[PDB]
Design a protein around this ligand. Structure first.
Ligand code: BO2
Ligand code: BO2
Ligand code: BO2
Ligand code: BO2
Ligand code: BO2
Ligand code: BO2
Ligand code: BO2
Ligand code: BO2
Ligand code: BO2
Lengths: 181, 178, 181, 178, 178, 181, 178, 181, 181
């Protein structure tokens, strides 16, 4: 067994890589297996991800909201873009983050230019607008902010230190070091 | 060159060509030529010939503004192809002076573009794409004389015209037959 | 065993990747095995796919319509192009989707230019037209729309939220979260 | 240049060359030259020489429109190769003035293109491909004098002609023998 | 060339074009032209026409410095597009002589750049980015007459203007209508 | 078993490769497994890394500070950039280095240019500044320097020989050769 | 060209431009122009205008040597940007004749380079990098009048100046205000 | 088992590939395992390497000097640059080389240009100078040369035949063929 | 087991690929294992190699000359450049070749240009000259030629048919077909 197989025996999934469809289908497959192995024991989800992806975000957003088990998110070094939404998507009272982890909340973007007629670009922009409102509505029900506050805050990159990510509501506890180590 | 010397001799006869994609280089070359020919004789017609696969909106709006603000009557000529910004500048000629050569084909379609960046950038681009597309359709409705609701319906996708179809639609005023 | 092997033991196949011939032959091989293991138990098909492919679509469209088992489709984060047709291709009463999954119905396209003489392009266009009518005839027998309504709706990209994908008829239930999680 | 100075000296003798693929640059150069030579002498023949592997339909329709609408009689000359839009502009010359040099080879074939985009875009392109191919075949039937059903049958794939085969088919009116 | 000969003939009529992205090559070409035209007649207006997608800040500050320090009144003309450094040099014209052609579109946005290197290098770049952005916003507040707090609020992201919106905002003083 | 599997049985992890997210998630998975196997036995962490990465640094900085086991860092040939911070991040009294290992402390940089508007670059520079202060605050609590001294020292590349890395406070012992060998 | 004809007409008015990165091509072009203008009139000022992002040390030392050894007084002008070898040649002008246009920005920084090859090659390069950096800092201390210990402290990393900051630092002697 | 697994059972490690960090961490993992399996039995180290790498050199230089076992180096076909230092780094009385093996001692270089300000290049050159002195100080304590002699000899490439590499002091015995073969 | 594992049980190694360091370290590992399994039983070495490499040549030249077992070389289809030297490097009385195998003896070359100062190129050329003399001295002690004859013969490519490679002395027997087959 790997370490990654050993953490999964203790119901811990790594996000680790960026949230694309390949990573989202991995995490959804891991969240549903861990739901079936013990639905009343908390899945822990370690997040060191640079973000990326919205449908892949909302694939593993909805799955960690679907499953019978409570999700404990732990931000390791980084939760940027989509991964900060997944960090807030843990169960309240859960959602740890290590003390030097940065949390980068950020409005949705298009990676590169997508061409098309203006009637096709009015739809790709009505979609990136409803991707923006869905990013802010999701992040408001998990941080307790007012979803126009998040639109003002995620208007640019807002890098949150873990101590000011629990003041923002992204996490709940900046988890302390166990032994001085 | 040779091809620049033939264009220079037609420029002496007040015949300019839009023969490429309308980018900022060809537009500033035409806007320079329209300003130069309106400075030589302010009362003699300029014969712009359109053989264009389209181009940039703002490049063609630079040409269209210099076509209007020149005291000359810009006679336009669909020569083979007047697509996108080429049909716009074709239909932008003086009324009674917009011509199609009999086998020119006129492509009318809504502007293409590309959305880029963050969702606040894209919401500004799409706000501006709705401004550009409304003004492009307002001017095509002004040029052709068609209703703007018909302009936005026909120019949803590619809407090809022959010289005889563009005559009855309103892009050109005559078809040259000699 | 992987999680993916564990979901397949519980008769769940991921679409996950885009629908190309490599992915279609995988899903057809998975649908026929799960038909042979228990033909009277519902195959579940998880769809997080960006679409793509029409013959690969109709390969796994026809197979999930062929098999003795009812197919339960679940849209995870995305069902675009072909995937949305496969999402509607589940059994009626089945066809779930997670609440923040987008469903992108979309007329068939050619990825890039295919050259040829006009007599060869009249055939590639009579094919992309009958690919369009087959996309609309398939999506009309599974959504209950009138197949000219779908031609008007899939004329551009129509991104459906899951709540308005069951109003469209693509899915049947936006499936609720089990525990608050 | 040298090659531009020799072309300029032949342009003084009203001999223009279609010597490349007919794209919008060479077409607008020829359309400029036909307009320039029809402005010098309106009653003297222009000797276009075709050495062309074909080209764009709309580029060649720009040339064909300027060949017709010029008051000059455009004498055309198949010089080595008159393929695709090159055979079209060869056969587009004035009747009695379409020549083939004795070892020129004339390639007649239906237009090539490419379908792109969504199925509603492609259904418009193929609708327009049927318009272009019908008009290209109508004009080849007008030029050669062949029936349009024979034009569409011969120009299904590549249909090569020698100078003597193109004479009896109808692309050229004579073969230069001096 | 042809396009250089038409620009040279407009340069004789004191009409220079900013028609590209404002980089150091186009800026030094315009700064050369403004110095050359201010040396011919020190009391006659220079008609700069802006068709520009923006450009470098320091390149446009070179043009803006030569526009101010020339004894001529630099009349500016939004011709199709004045985006970024193009709107800056548009609004940098002499008051009463900043024109927009009626379909020109003015894009106002804060400067783009890129941070590079070590954290001590980047802290100097961002210190200088705050200097450039404050001076760019101070001058746009000076040109338009808007408050600098409104300039920094509107020019946060892309802020598009029509010719009539830029007239009431303050970039241009008139709209050419002839 | 590999040698790498054999060193991990003796609770030794290699850093080895540069600190990116792929390497950080490996080391965090290894540090948490070795914490769970025996939380009161010292994890050894071998560092031959050229550095790189700050969020990946602070991912495995925080984890080696989190775990119940004391971390013994050993610099093998190189601890450059982020890896020198991880070298100092071992437990005091631990933190060895081989006698010809170089330690390259270094202020954070951006690999290549990141474009954007100035309001977006004021945030990427306020982040690389707080990445710089966090690099110096972390390296001051582990070397005992005054964090403005480290700003003066890491202003350029400061390559420390192991004998002058214990004078700097990065390591504690330049560990002697066992047999002459 | 056009841009070469405007530069040639300013060269007749003894106005040369350093408008690019100072490489050996632009340096040998300026050194040729300084030698050509010092041969026409040995007693009339040469107005070098700096719009430069920097460049090579040895290329700029070629210009600086021809600026000193010309009998003309090289008036220098920071036009938009006088970075690196551009600020060096700006400050290398005749005292009383080093000007900054009011929005030019002066970047002062130590020379960049690259070490290559074996450790005996690099020990020679770094020996020579210490010679170049000491001589560059000695001349900036001579030009500005600042101490060489302040020159090496400010020019450790990028040290940006406005036109008013470079005036009090010593790069320029005046700021042009007309 | 491979042949490489079979040679390692007889306490033989191949250098084989060039000395980069991937190869250095392999050899250090192999040297420490073979130290733990039997610390009083001689590790043999076969060297057919084209060299490369200085921190990776001094990683496996220090490890073969650290371990309790004596190291027997054998140059197979080539010990260039770094690998010639490792060839001399064997135990005295050990350090064989095959009769047609070339030994290429060579001063440290930079593979390609590294850019930077001159204050950053004064440090990369003070490092490649102390990499040069450390290459010469290491090669002087193992060959018995005077470390200015090695600076004169490694000023260019000095390719040593095995018979003149024991005269130089790099190896001790040019080992004879066992049977005529 | 593969066929290659089966031939190695019968003490046959393939050269097969070109002689680079990766192939030389494989063959040296195979020659030393087969020496240890039975040092008095003849290792057979099948050579279908296009050559290449001189230090990799002299790595497996010296090893097949080192080992206690006699080496039987068999040229299969080709022994070019370095592999023809290895073909002659078998034991006398051994060194077969199949009847249509070509043997290409050839002076050493540099693959591509190596740059440098002339004092560095006087050393790379004194090395390719002593690589040439070592190629000719090795090929003279195994063919019985006079080493100036080989310099005249390998001055260009000398492709030897197997029947004229035993006249040259490269091989000893052109081995006959067993059954007509
Ligand atoms: C903050 C959350 C919402 C995610 C952030 N951005 C997005 O929403 C991502 C960014 C992205 C990633 C890959 C390719 C294109 C765009 N948005 C999307 O995935 C996306 C997909 N289709 C259309 C529009 N946006 B993150 O990637 O910065
Ligand atoms: C004329 C209109 C109706 C249709 C097309 N015009 C456009 O939309 C072109 C698209 C284009 C052209 C050249 C380079 C880049 C982009 N206009 C533009 O440049 C453009 C694109 N997006 C927004 C505003 N303007 B046509 O000219 O291709
Ligand atoms: C909505 C369903 C029908 C699928 C959508 N489009 C298609 O039908 C796909 C899109 C596609 C994918 C890959 C390469 C080229 C084209 N069409 C085809 O696969 C296809 C294949 N051969 C000819 C014409 N179309 B999807 O890919 O947007
Ligand atoms: C000309 C007729 C007889 C047949 C052939 N025509 C074509 O293939 C050309 C293809 C081409 C050539 C050069 C540049 C751009 C496009 N036809 C067209 O221009 C074309 C193709 N599709 C739609 C409209 N026009 B020939 O030129 O090879
Ligand atoms: C005029 C301002 C307010 C708006 C935009 N400016 C910029 O983004 C330009 C970017 C650019 C453009 C072309 C070449 C080089 C750099 N700003 C700069 O020149 C710049 C960038 N970083 C630091 C200092 N100046 B415009 O160019 O779109
Ligand atoms: C000394 C420690 C802090 C690490 C050093 N530098 C950093 O902090 C690294 C250097 C680096 C590596 C890869 C890509 C971009 C930048 N900084 C970052 O990782 C980083 C990431 N996002 C924004 C800003 N910096 B090391 O990489 O020189
Ligand atoms: C000029 C002084 C103030 C500082 C900077 N100089 C340099 O970085 C330039 C780098 C450069 C630039 C263009 C072409 C070739 C080399 N310095 C040199 O030319 C140089 C570098 N190393 C040794 C000798 N000369 B500036 O030009 O960026
Ligand atoms: C005795 C050895 C060390 C001498 C030569 N090797 C080196 O000097 C090697 C070759 C190399 C590898 C990567 C990047 C730059 C240089 N030097 C280094 O490892 C190195 C690393 N950082 C700075 C300076 N040199 B040899 O392998 O050519
Ligand atoms: C005939 C025997 C000696 C080998 C022949 N040639 C050589 O000696 C080979 C040819 C070769 C192969 C790969 C890369 C560069 C050069 N020479 C070398 O390996 C070599 C290596 N370093 C310096 C000089 N020559 B064979 O490769 O043609």
């Amino acid at each position: 067994s790997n370490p990654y197989n050993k953490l999964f025996e203790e119901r811990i999934i790594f996000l680790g890589v960026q949230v694309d469809d390949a990573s989202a289908n991995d995490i959804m497959a891991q969240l549903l297996v861990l739901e079936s192995l013990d639905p009343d024991r908390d899945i822990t989800m370690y997040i060191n991800s640079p973000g990326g992806g919205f449908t892949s975000l909302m694939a593993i957003y909805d799955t960690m909201q679907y499953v019978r088990a409570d999700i404990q998110t732990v931000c390791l070094g980084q939760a940027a873009s989509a991964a900060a939404v997944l960090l807030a998507a843990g169960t309240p009272g859960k959602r740890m983050a290590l003390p030097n982890a940065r949390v980068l909340i950020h409005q949705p973007s298009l990676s590169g230019v997508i061409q098309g007629q203006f009637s096709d670009l009015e739809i790709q922009a009505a979609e990136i607008e409803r991707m923006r409102t869905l990013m802010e509505t999701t992040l408001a029900r998990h941080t307790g902010k007012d979803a126009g506050v998040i639109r003002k805050d995620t208007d640019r990159d807002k890098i949150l230190t873990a101590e000011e990510a629990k003041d923002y509501g992204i996490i709940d506890t900046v988890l302390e070091y166990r032994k001085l180590s | 060159s040779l091809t620049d010397s033939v264009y220079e001799r037609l420029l002496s006869e007040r015949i300019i060509f839009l023969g490429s994609e309308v980018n900022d280089e060809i537009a500033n070359r035409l806007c320079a030529q329209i300003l130069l020919l309106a400075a030589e004789d302010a009362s003699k017609d300029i014969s712009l010939y359109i053989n264009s696969p389209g181009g940039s909106i703002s490049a063609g709006m630079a040409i269209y503004d210099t076509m209007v603000l020149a005291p000359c009557d810009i006679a336009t000529y669909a020569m083979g192809m007047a697509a996108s910004m080429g049909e716009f500048l074709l239909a932008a000629g003086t009324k009674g002076k917009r011509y199609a050569l009999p086998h020119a084909r006129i492509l009318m379609h809504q502007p293409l573009g590309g959305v880029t960046g963050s969702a606040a950038d894209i919401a500004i681009q799409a706000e501006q794409f709705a401004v550009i597309k409304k003004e492009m359709f307002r001017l095509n409705a002004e040029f052709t004389g068609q209703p703007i609701e018909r302009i936005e319906a026909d120019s949803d996708r590619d809407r090809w015209f022959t010289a005889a179809e563009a005559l009855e639609y309103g892009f050109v005023d005559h078809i040259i037959t000699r």
